[PDB]
Amino acid sequence: IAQGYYPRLWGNDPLDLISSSASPLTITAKGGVKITVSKQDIENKIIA
Amino acid sequence: KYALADRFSFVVSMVINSQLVKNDDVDPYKLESWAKTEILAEFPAHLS
């Protein structure tokens, strides 16, 4: 990482990017089934 | 050579509806490979 900078994961809004169709994170079950979840579901499961 | 191959000795045909794999997030070929792996354990040894 260049001097004066820090790495920020998945941009400004991570959860929105994960729920997007162009998400860099890909989850596959049963070999060939893609799994997609809305952003609100991930927000609910995150515990403060 | 397709006609020379034996097609009647211990061969079973499985006719499947294609509506099952009709889905936006389902890859039929990867899913089909997984299903064969799951079924193989209990399948008869001398059958195709």
Side-chain angles (χ1 to χ4, degrees):
Chain A
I1 321 290
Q3 195 270 350
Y5 296 100
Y6 73 91
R8 156 162 80 179
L9 190 66
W10 292 322
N12 287 318
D13 204 328
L15 295 193
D16 183 62
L17 183 50
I18 312 280
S19 283
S20 174
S21 62
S23 155
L25 173 79
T26 302
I27 315 292
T28 279
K30 310 249 208 170
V33 189
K34 222 200 77 177
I35 283 143
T36 313
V37 279
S38 90
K39 159 154 160 165
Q40 272 52 49
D41 314 307
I42 308 182
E43 275 189 357
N44 282 239
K45 291 305 185 154
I46 280 157
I47 39 186
Chain B
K1 302 312 170 209
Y2 285 176
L4 282 310
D6 191 359
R7 295 127 64 221
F8 299 84
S9 287
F10 303 119
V11 188
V12 179
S13 284
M14 176 150 105
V15 163
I16 329 174
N17 194 316
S18 66
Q19 172 54 75
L20 262 300
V21 299
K22 161 59 141 43
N23 200 3
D24 310 13
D25 37 2
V26 169
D27 188 358
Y29 283 90
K30 293 219 197 86
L31 179 81
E32 172 199 76
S33 306
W34 168 89
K36 278 131 71 71
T37 304
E38 198 96 334
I39 281 297
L40 164 68
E42 316 168 338
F43 206 65
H46 66 296
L47 274 187
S48 299

